[PDB]
Enzyme design. Structure first.
Site, PDB file in Angstrom:
ATOM      1  N   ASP A 172     -44.863  28.960 -15.917  1.00 20.41           N
ATOM      2  CA  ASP A 172     -45.448  28.368 -17.119  1.00 20.41           C
ATOM      3  C   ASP A 172     -45.322  26.845 -17.146  1.00 20.41           C
ATOM      4  O   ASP A 172     -45.817  26.193 -18.074  1.00 20.41           O
ATOM      5  CB  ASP A 172     -44.778  28.951 -18.378  1.00 20.41           C
ATOM      6  CG  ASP A 172     -45.717  28.999 -19.575  1.00 20.41           C
ATOM      7  OD1 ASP A 172     -46.899  29.344 -19.409  1.00 20.41           O
ATOM      8  OD2 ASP A 172     -45.257  28.743 -20.710  1.00 20.41           O
ATOM      9  N   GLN A 205     -41.288  32.549 -23.995  1.00 18.88           N
ATOM     10  CA  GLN A 205     -42.312  32.273 -25.008  1.00 18.88           C
ATOM     11  C   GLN A 205     -41.798  31.332 -26.115  1.00 18.88           C
ATOM     12  O   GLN A 205     -40.849  31.658 -26.814  1.00 18.88           O
ATOM     13  CB  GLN A 205     -42.831  33.583 -25.594  1.00 18.88           C
ATOM     14  CG  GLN A 205     -43.972  33.388 -26.583  1.00 18.88           C
ATOM     15  CD  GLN A 205     -45.215  32.770 -25.966  1.00 18.88           C
ATOM     16  OE1 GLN A 205     -45.687  33.220 -24.926  1.00 18.88           O
ATOM     17  NE2 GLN A 205     -45.775  31.768 -26.628  1.00 18.88           N
ATOM     18  N   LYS A 226     -50.350  38.030 -22.427  1.00 19.81           N
ATOM     19  CA  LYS A 226     -49.960  37.559 -21.111  1.00 19.81           C
ATOM     20  C   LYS A 226     -49.627  38.722 -20.180  1.00 19.81           C
ATOM     21  O   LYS A 226     -50.073  38.740 -19.034  1.00 19.81           O
ATOM     22  CB  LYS A 226     -48.826  36.519 -21.251  1.00 19.81           C
ATOM     23  CG  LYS A 226     -49.353  35.231 -21.873  1.00 19.81           C
ATOM     24  CD  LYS A 226     -48.286  34.253 -22.375  1.00 19.81           C
ATOM     25  CE  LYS A 226     -48.946  33.081 -23.114  1.00 19.81           C
ATOM     26  NZ  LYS A 226     -47.969  32.032 -23.580  1.00 19.81           N
TER      27      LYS A 226
END
Ligand SMILES: NC(=O)c1ccc[n+]([C@@H]2O[C@H](COP(=O)([O-])OP(=O)(O)OC[C@H]3O[C@@H](n4cnc5c(N)ncnc54)[C@H](OP(=O)(O)O)[C@@H]3O)[C@@H](O)[C@H]2O)c1
Ligand SMILES: NC(=O)c1ccc[n+]([C@@H]2O[C@H](COP(=O)([O-])OP(=O)(O)OC[C@H]3O[C@@H](n4cnc5c(N)ncnc54)[C@H](OP(=O)(O)O)[C@@H]3O)[C@@H](O)[C@H]2O)c1
Ligand SMILES: [Cl-]
Ligand SMILES: [Cl-]
Ligand SMILES: [Cl-]
Ligand SMILES: [Cl-]
Ligand SMILES: [Cl-]
Lengths: 286, 282
Positions: B120, B97, B53
């Site tokens: 996200d 994450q 990412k």
């Protein structure tokens, strides 16, 4: 034959029962604190059905020892004006819950206004935040109609986990929350709408069917699975008894359990709102 | 016969104009867009995903702020870190994450990310907004899937979509996004009875279970659009949540694993970060 007929899911009775408990809770709270729980009801414009629903909700407040603050705004109210009224209510520590009666006049951005209601006062369960929290298992007041339905099902010992539930309709305040609530209860959930193909077949696959389309008797009795649990969230006034979104004439030979119309979902919508308002008042005054 | 839904190629294509946008923004403002990435603990796959990412950020001219916290981080500590990032005007997006160490209330931490920085698409508020048609960054994986379907001209309206899995960050948002696109949507999970039956009726099937090749090829409808959101590393090539060996004989279109959903998860995150930076800086 009498024994084999569907269980009537008696929302009228359940609502009355819940209200007995709400009343003693409200009287205890008033005695302890000196203060009365308040539901603010906002009625925008002249819709007759909306006025009736607000009147019924105010009556339910008073039945359980609470009162309502009746806000009546003109039909030409703007989004900006309604937002300002909601923010006033958000800021008023004497108001424990806020109801915006849907549908508001169509020049208003209803979603924006729903979303302006503070989470703590979202006793009808209309905010995006409340919906998201509910969908993810976090604490929030639930949308009144679907939460009322879940209560009817649970208090009548209806099995949900592992069943195939079909929700016909996907509105923001009914079909969508209904679907998420059934999913949280471990149903497999199918959500249908006006662009659904093969609707009769999908309904026939349903162990639990929720009619939430706002069209009188759209869901046909011949689409219903023998032994299904049938929940009709519609109401359409008619001479000699109103009807819902499902053909319920003779449903007792088909369903294992069903909500009558009237007297099923309707009373539990109102009572859920008032229960969530009592909860909000108990929290605020504690 | 199946159309390969090529996520790698689409990601590359999309990154071209993201780079143009970012370079224009930097030239105009003198500021570099930043994605804060939060890696909590020692999971190897998580570390790899975060690096991928960050690399994607750099490919389009942005930078990352790399936050690494220990395995034994508490909910309180992670919330405190997220709040620092929310209030840091040099950070335009925040990625936490998943999956964080088990002792952490991941949902509480996701929900602490400010809506403006939720690139996200993990917040409850963002999910609720999306579900009701209001503007919000979408959960990266399902939003990426929607982009793959749209860019490949896949018909969604009126189709029966079946989403197998109902996770907060994948199956649930996937379902709501397909519903908005006018699919009829069935959501399945570990308590579903007759899963093969339901899959067999899917015009669009999304595998979101996190179990290698759980969804059997024999359950797939002839002509279905097959989306496999799983990834399970294996010697000589990872596999997803669906049996895809021979899928080209059955599906009208399918996402390969690897190279389908995966690149588009990353691309969606970076795109949404570009959007957040443009809003904050423009
Ligand atoms: O206002 P209101 O009380 O009517 O509620 P509403 O907010 O109009 O919601 C009605 C819901 O029922 C759905 N619906 C309407 N006609 C339908 C049909 N013939 N078949 C399947 N679903 C149908 C609508 O589909 P859409 O969401 O596709 O309009 C909508 O989701
Ligand atoms: O953690 P993670 O990355 O694995 O994702 P996750 O957050 O565990 O999500 C996995 C999803 O797949 C579902 N699932 C797991 N096994 C299944 C099965 N055998 N059949 C149907 N659905 C199944 C789970 O059902 P549940 O939500 O019922 O656990 C869950 O919704
Ligand atoms: Cl009007
Ligand atoms: Cl759930
Ligand atoms: Cl990195
Ligand atoms: Cl690279
Ligand atoms: Cl929708």
């Amino acid at each position: 034959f009498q024994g084999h007929m569907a269980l009537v899911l008696d929302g009228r009775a359940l609502a009355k029962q819940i209200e007995e408990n709400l009343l003693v809770r409200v009287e205890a709270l008033k005695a302890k604190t000196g203060r009365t729980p308040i539901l603010a009801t906002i009625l925008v414009g002249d819709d007759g059905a909306s006025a009736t629903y607000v009147r019924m909700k105010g009556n339910a407040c008073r039945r359980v020892g609470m009162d309502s603050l009746k806000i009546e705004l003109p039909q030409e109210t703007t989004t900006e004006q309604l937002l300002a009224e909601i923010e006033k209510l958000n800021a008023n520590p004497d108001v424990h819950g806020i109801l915006l009666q849907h549908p508001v006049p169509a020049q208003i951005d209803e979603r924006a206004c729903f979303d302006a209601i503070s989470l703590a006062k979202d006793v009808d369960g209309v905010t995006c935040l409340g919906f998201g929290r509910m969908a993810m298992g976090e604490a929030a007041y639930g949308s009144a109609t679907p939460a009322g339905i879940m209560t009817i099902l649970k208090e009548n010992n209806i099995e949900i986990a592992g069943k195939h539930a079909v929700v016909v309709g996907r509105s923001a305040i009914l079909g969508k929350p209904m679907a998420m609530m059934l999913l949280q209860a471990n149903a497999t959930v199918t959500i249908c709408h006006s662009r659904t193909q093969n609707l009769p077949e999908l309904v026939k696959q349903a162990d639990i069917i929720v009619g939430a389309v706002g069209k009188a008797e759209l869901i046909q009795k011949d689409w219903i699975k023998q032994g299904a649990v049938v929940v009709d969230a519609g109401f359409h006034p008619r001479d000699g008894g109103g009807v819902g979104d499902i053909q319920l004439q003779g449903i007792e030979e088909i369903a294992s359990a069903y909500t009558p119309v009237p007297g099923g979902v309707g009373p539990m919508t109102i009572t859920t709102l008032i229960r969530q308002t009592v909860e909000a008042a108990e929290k605020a005054l504690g």
